[PDB]
């Protein structure tokens, strides 16, 4: 490996061998069908709300999130980079697809597949990823840096449906070598959203944009139809000329054939036919190819950028609504703008690299923090783009000031912005994209007093329940299968209108969002204040026994939705205390004296009784009325965790909080698989995992990272990082279960998982508060 020195990969990048087989991979531990796309994954490409594309460590474009809210794992084999090399003096060169695999049928059989093992590495530090190619049959060593411009405090480039591939080629040998790099792409119009005639009308055109010191050559792969529909738009691939390279192209090769129309050209001398051909296809799949060829002398390095864009302006949800995607603000809505997007990237990618470096540098340069922590901190952010992210710029046929946003809970449980989850998972948004975060919370504010008295069948018990109760915060803002933003509470497995954590978590999120954006946004507090008061006032009505605290009902009625709480719980109780303290402080800021007094009175009563009911001398009991009420819950003081972040002070005595956190580390972490797998949710006081429900026996990745942040704030530095380390290890390490770029909600002691690609572990960003 002589190429690594010619590029700049951070030491904290996650690494794996190209073509590496992973032997320890976990699988779902549930009885019901659940997504398992295996461990062949990579960091995604694409902006927020753009649709994303997962290019895996083996090189394939395989995890398709272009249909917003859907996960489709299938390798489109025509989409590749390939290389040709010929040593000066030799009669023949070699050509190789840079993909560690081969197609499953006979399409593209002429191409040279099966990039060999032990011949290159993949690296990722989101939003960047890299491949290096160090192959005994390729004398010139190559590397590529690929990324999209995901940039904190930037709502423009961060939305773009674009990727850059910055190639570096170096000749360490003593002979001249001719080298070509070729990007192939299938015209994927009709891959989704089209009910018949999936390739019909697809056609490819070549754009040559020549100006002074700028030559771009690109293929635009579109359809003859000018219809404005979810399926229609354009893909583009292209390259920018640099000194010492020549560009060649082929407009049209058949992807549903053996590929020799292209490969007989590329494999001879790495130079394509430059054949334009705008003939639309009928049934055949078609694709385009863009190549560069250059001669490298001994010791010479060359850099050359390629790009990919996709202009698919319309997202459609299963309930029928069609929306424009956010990036259309910057490029237009007609779906004929892929070249403009590509050109912007090829002319500005160096600026974008610097902008990414500028935001990663404060963390990467901090030599007090271990590299593993940096690996997880940046790579968990993959989910912000890869979580079915929807970001609208108008309803089709509709202008408003704001752009509504939603991130999925996950794909298995297809609900936008699930609030009990976003309490943990929204840290990156408030910290890095706060205008999105505040927009989401206004979306929730607007739902508080919505009443939908139409009844739905509850999945878990078959009862009928009201869809949405006035004054109760919704579980979610809809499903991609139905109507995001319009029809809330798509979750129907249980009735969220009786949950005891949603209304408190809502208030805590509101005040968090004020505090972590500098305590200056009084307008945001004003917008949300009525909803805050309503939410707490409704929750107060659920106090059955007048101890000042809402009663859990002995059926799951909170985020641990199979782990029943009854009476006063540490979890819902502490969240309630913190929410009351938050509302007092908002009352003070907004000069609402009567609200301040009321919530102060409720707080003092509830605080006294919480302590009396639950403090046992070592930790806070799980609850007051359950069969294993004395279980040690990892998340028992979630309200105090948030109170620390919100600078609300002590809701419980410092001594008791410290004792409780030490007990959780000693038991839920260190007595669970030697503290190498995170914090198990429930442990009995005898040091045996609580078996009352599956959730008690799970580690929740997002709960564990949040607990680590709580420990860190409380000065338990070693315990914090040791607790988080087990989550990192399981997700990323060779000794773990292969969950990189699909971090799950949960695992059990055997390492098997529930709900890959989950929002909650974005809570790792609470460790950066």
Ligand X SMILES: OC[C@H]1O[C@@H](O[C@@H]2[C@@H](O)[C@H](O)O[C@H](CO)[C@H]2O)[C@H](O)[C@@H](O)[C@@H]1O
Residue numbers belonging to the annotated binding site for Ca(2+): 543, 545, 547, 549, 551
Residues that contact ligand X, how many (by CB under 6 A): 11
Of 4-12, 220-228, 416-424, 624-632: span binding ligand X (CB under 6 A): 416-424
Nearest residue relative to ligand X (C-beta):
413
Smallest separation (angstroms) from ligand X to the CB of 33:
11
What is the residue whose two structure tokens read 């009396």? 612
Nearer to ligand X, 133 or 753 (CB): 753
Nearer to Ca ion, 278 or 545 (CB): 545
What is the residue whose two structure tokens read 């390490």? 733
Nearer to Ca ion, 622 or 700 (CB): 622
Confirm or reject binding of residue 8 to Ca ion (CB under 5 A): no
Confirm or reject binding of residue 559 to ligand X (CB under 6 A): yes
Nearer to ligand X, 380 or 420 (CB): 420
Phi, psi of 649 (to 5 degrees): 75, -155
Vertex 418: Cα angle to 413 and 420 (nearest 5)? 115
Q: Pick from 421, 477, 572, 578 the residue near ligand X by CB under 6 A.
A: 421
Name the 3-class secondary structure at 290.
strand
β-partners of residue 325 are 392
C-alpha distance from residue 51 to each of 144, 162, 311, 327, 384 (Å): 22, 10, 10, 11, 11
Q: Which amino acids are annotated as binding site, given as ranges?
A: 543, 545, 547, 549, 551
Smallest separation (angstroms) from Ca ion to the CB of 547:
4
Confirm or reject binding of residue 699 to ligand X (CB under 6 A): no
Confirm or reject binding of residue 557 to ligand X (CB under 6 A): no
Nearer to Ca ion, 445 or 539 (CB): 539
Q: What is the dihedral of CA 427, 432, 433, 435, to 10 degrees?
A: 90
Q: What CA–CA distance (Å, rounded) separates 116 from 91? A: 23
Q: Pick from 420, 551, 635, 644 the residue near ligand X by CB under 6 A.
A: 420
Asked if the bond preceding 578 is cis, omega within 30° of 0, the reply is no
Smallest separation (angstroms) from ligand X to the CB of 212:
56
Site for Ca ion in 503-562 (CB under 5 A): 543, 545, 547, 549, 551
Residues that contact Ca ion, how many (by CB under 5 A): 5
Q: What CA–CA distance (Å, rounded) separates 131 from 371? A: 20
Q: Which does 338 bind (CB under 5 to 8 A by kind): Ca ion, ligand X, none?
A: none
Site string for ligand X, 41-70 (x = CB under 6 A): ------------------------------
Q: What CA–CA distance (Å, rounded) separates 661 from 710? A: 9
Q: What is the dihedral of CA 222, 227, 230, 234, to 10 degrees?
A: 20
What is the residue whose two structure tokens read 């989910």? 383
Q: Which does 167 bind (CB under 5 to 8 A by kind): ligand X, Ca ion, none?
A: none
Smallest separation (angstroms) from ligand X to the CB of 699:
12
Q: What CA–CA distance (Å, rounded) separates 697 from 695? A: 5
Nearer to ligand X, 107 or 481 (CB): 481
Name the 3-class secondary structure at 222.
strand
Confirm or reject binding of residue 372 to ligand X (CB under 6 A): no
Nearer to ligand X, 306 or 413 (CB): 413
Beta strands in 396-449 (DSSP E): 405-406
Q: Which does 545 bind (CB under 5 to 8 A by kind): ligand X, Ca ion, none?
A: Ca ion
Site for Ca ion in 427-486 (CB under 5 A): none
Of 135-143, 172-180, 369-377, 407-415: span binding ligand X (CB under 6 A): 407-415
Q: What is the dihedral of CA 417, 418, 420, 425, to 10 degrees?
A: -50
- DSSP annotation of 279 reads P
Q: Which does 641 bind (CB under 5 to 8 A by kind): ligand X, Ca ion, none?
A: none
Confirm or reject binding of residue 625 to Ca ion (CB under 5 A): no
Q: Which does 549 bind (CB under 5 to 8 A by kind): Ca ion, ligand X, none?
A: Ca ion
Confirm or reject binding of residue 561 to ligand X (CB under 6 A): yes
Nearer to ligand X, 127 or 556 (CB): 556
Smallest separation (angstroms) from ligand X to the CB of 404:
20
Smallest separation (angstroms) from Ca ion to the CB of 623:
11
Smallest separation (angstroms) from ligand X to the CB of 689:
17
Confirm or reject binding of residue 456 to ligand X (CB under 6 A): no
Site for ligand X in 726-755 (CB under 6 A): 745
Smallest separation (angstroms) from ligand X to the CB of 122:
30
Confirm or reject binding of residue 418 to ligand X (CB under 6 A): yes
- DSSP annotation of 609 reads H
Nearer to Ca ion, 542 or 706 (CB): 542
Smallest separation (angstroms) from ligand X to the CB of 557:
11
- Environment class of 89 (CB within 10 Å of its CB; exposed 0-12, middle 13-18, buried 19+): exposed
Are 584 and 507 a contacting pair, CB within 8 Å?
Answer: no
Q: Inter-axis angle of helices 570-589 and 638-645, to 10 degrees?
A: 30
Of 243-251, 356-364, 375-383, 410-418: span binding ligand X (CB under 6 A): 410-418
Smallest separation (angstroms) from ligand X to the CB of 420:
5
Q: Pick from 157, 178, 265, 409 the residue near ligand X by CB under 6 A.
A: 409
CA torsion through residues 681, 683, 688, 689, sign: negative
How many other C-beta atoms are found inside a 10 Å radius of the C-beta of residue 340? 15
Smallest separation (angstroms) from ligand X to the CB of 29:
12
Q: What CA–CA distance (Å, rounded) separates 751 from 120? A: 29
Smallest separation (angstroms) from Ca ion to the CB of 580:
14
Name the 3-class secondary structure at 755.
coil
Nearer to Ca ion, 551 or 733 (CB): 551
Q: Which does 265 bind (CB under 5 to 8 A by kind): ligand X, Ca ion, none?
A: none
Site for ligand X in 468-497 (CB under 6 A): 491, 493
DSSP letters spanning 565-603: -EESBHHHHHHHHHHHHHHHHHHHHTT-HHHHHHHHHHH
Smallest separation (angstroms) from ligand X to the CB of 568:
20
Beta-carbon contacts of 82 under 8 Å, excluding residues fewer than 6 positions away, are 95, 96, 97, 98, 111, 112, 181, 182, 184, 266
Asked if the bond preceding 127 is cis, omega within 30° of 0, the reply is yes
Beta-carbon contacts of 439 under 8 Å, excluding residues fewer than 6 positions away, are 402, 403, 404, 405
Q: Which does 493 bind (CB under 5 to 8 A by kind): Ca ion, ligand X, none?
A: ligand X
Are 570 and 651 a contacting pair, CB within 8 Å?
Answer: no
Smallest separation (angstroms) from Ca ion to the CB of 692:
22
What is the residue whose two structure tokens read 């002590």? 650
Characterise 87 by phi-psi region: left (phi > 0), alpha (psi -120 to 50), beta (else).
beta
CA torsion through residues 740, 726, 703, 13, sign: negative
Confirm or reject binding of residue 20 to Ca ion (CB under 5 A): no
Are 246 and 294 a contacting pair, CB within 8 Å?
Answer: yes
Q: What CA–CA distance (Å, rounded) separates 115 from 135? A: 9
Nearer to ligand X, 193 or 639 (CB): 639
Nearer to Ca ion, 108 or 606 (CB): 606
Nearer to ligand X, 386 or 420 (CB): 420
- Half-sphere exposure in the Cβ direction for 551 (13 Å, CA): 14
Are 83 and 142 a contacting pair, CB within 8 Å?
Answer: yes
Q: Which does 559 bind (CB under 5 to 8 A by kind): ligand X, Ca ion, none?
A: ligand X
Nearer to Ca ion, 547 or 623 (CB): 547
**Which residues sit at the interface with Ca ion, rule CB under 5 A?**
543, 545, 547, 549, 551
Residues that bind ligand X (CB under 6 A): 409, 413, 415, 418, 420-421, 491, 493, 559, 561, 745
């Amino acid at each position: 490996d002589k190429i690594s020195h010619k590029i700049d990969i951070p030491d904290s990048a996650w690494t794996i061998g190209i073509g590496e087989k992973f032997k320890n991979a976990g699988h779902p531990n549930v009885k019901y069908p659940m997504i398992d796309d295996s461990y062949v994954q990579g960091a995604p490409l694409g902006g927020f709300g753009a649709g994303t594309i997962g290019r895996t460590y083996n090189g394939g474009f395989s995890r398709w999130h272009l249909e917003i809210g859907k996960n489709k794992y299938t390798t489109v084999y025509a989409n590749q980079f390939s290389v040709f090399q010929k040593v000066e003096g030799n009669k023949d060169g070699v050509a190789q697809v840079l993909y560690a695999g081969e197609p499953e049928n006979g399409y593209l059989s002429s191409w040279k597949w099966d990039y060999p093992k032990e011949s290159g590495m993949y690296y990722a530090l989101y939003p960047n990823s890299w491949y290096t190619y160090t192959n005994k049959d390729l004398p010139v060593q190559l590397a590529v840096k690929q990324f999209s411009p995901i940039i904190p405090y930037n709502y423009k480039e961060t939305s773009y449906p674009v990727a850059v591939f910055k190639w570096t080629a170096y000749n360490p040998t003593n002979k001249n070598v001719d080298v070509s790099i070729m990007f192939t792409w299938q015209n994927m119009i009709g891959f989704f959203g089209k009910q018949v005639n999936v390739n019909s009308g697809n056609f490819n055109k070549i754009i040559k944009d020549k100006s002074k010191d700028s030559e771009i050559v690109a293929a635009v792969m579109g359809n003859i139809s000018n219809d404005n529909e979810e399926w229609n738009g354009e893909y583009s691939i292209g390259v920018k000329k640099v000194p010492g390279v020549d560009i060649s192209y082929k407009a049209k090769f058949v992807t549903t054939g053996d590929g020799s129309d292209l490969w007989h050209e590329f494999s001879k001398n790495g130079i394509l036919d430059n054949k334009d051909d705008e003939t639309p296809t009928k049934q055949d799949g078609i694709g385009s190819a863009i190549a560069v060829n250059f001669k490298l002398q001994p010791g010479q390095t060359i850099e050359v950028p390629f790009a990919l864009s996709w202009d698919l302006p319309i997202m459609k949800f299963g309930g029928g609504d069609k929306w424009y995607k956010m990036y259309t603000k910057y490029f237009g809505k007609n779906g004929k703008n892929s070249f403009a997007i590509l050109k912007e990237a090829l002319n500005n990618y160096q600026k974008w690299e610097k902008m990414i470096d500028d935001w990663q540098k404060p963390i990467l340069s901090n030599k007090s923090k271990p590299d593993w922590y940096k690996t997880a901190l940046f790579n968990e952010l993959y989910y912000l783009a890869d979580g079915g992210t929807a970001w609208e710029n108008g309803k089709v046929g509709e202008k408003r000031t704001n752009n509504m946003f939603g991130l999925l809970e996950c794909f298995d449980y297809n609900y936008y912005e699930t609030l009990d989850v976003r309490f943990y998972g929204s840290f990156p948004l408030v910290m890095l994209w706060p205008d999105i975060e505040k927009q989401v919370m206004r979306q929730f504010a607007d739902t508080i007093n919505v009443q939908d008295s139409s009844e739905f069948k509850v999945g878990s018990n078959g009862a009928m329940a009201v869809k949405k109760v006035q004054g109760m915060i919704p579980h979610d803002l809809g499903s991609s299968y139905a109507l995001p933003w319009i029809k809330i509470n798509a979750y129907d497995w249980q009735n969220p209108n009786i949950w005891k954590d949603l209304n408190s978590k809502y208030v805590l999120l509101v005040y968090r969002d004020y505090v972590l954006t500098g305590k200056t946004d009084k307008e945001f507090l004003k917008y949300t204040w009525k909803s805050v008061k309503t939410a707490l006032d409704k929750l107060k009505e659920m106090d059955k026994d007048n101890d000042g605290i809402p009663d859990n009902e002995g059926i799951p009625d909170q985020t641990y939705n199979t782990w029943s709480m009854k009476g006063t719980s540490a979890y819902c109780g502490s969240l309630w205390l913190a929410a009351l303290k938050a509302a007092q402080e908002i009352g003070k800021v907004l000069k609402d004296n009567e609200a301040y007094i009321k919530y102060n009175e409720w707080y003092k009563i509830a605080q006294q009784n919480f302590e009396k009911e639950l403090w046992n001398g070592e930790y806070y009991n799980f609850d007051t009325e359950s069969d294993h009420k004395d279980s040690i819950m990892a998340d028992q003081l979630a309200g105090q965790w948030y109170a620390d972040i919100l600078r609300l002070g002590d809701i419980l005595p410092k001594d008791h909080v410290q004792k409780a956190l030490k007990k959780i580390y000693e038991f839920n972490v260190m007595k669970f698989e030697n503290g190498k797998m995170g914090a198990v949710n429930g442990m009995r006081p005898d040091g045996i995992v609580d078996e009352s429900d599956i959730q008690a026996q799970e580690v929740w990745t997002g709960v564990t990272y949040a607990l680590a942040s709580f420990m860190k704030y409380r000065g338990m530095t070693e315990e914090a990082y040791n607790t988080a380390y087990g989550v990192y290890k399981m997700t990323y390490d060779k000794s773990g279960k292969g969950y990189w770029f699909r971090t799950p909600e949960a695992w059990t002691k055997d390492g098997n998982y529930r709900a890959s690609m989950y929002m909650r572990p974005l809570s790792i960003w609470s460790m950066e508060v």
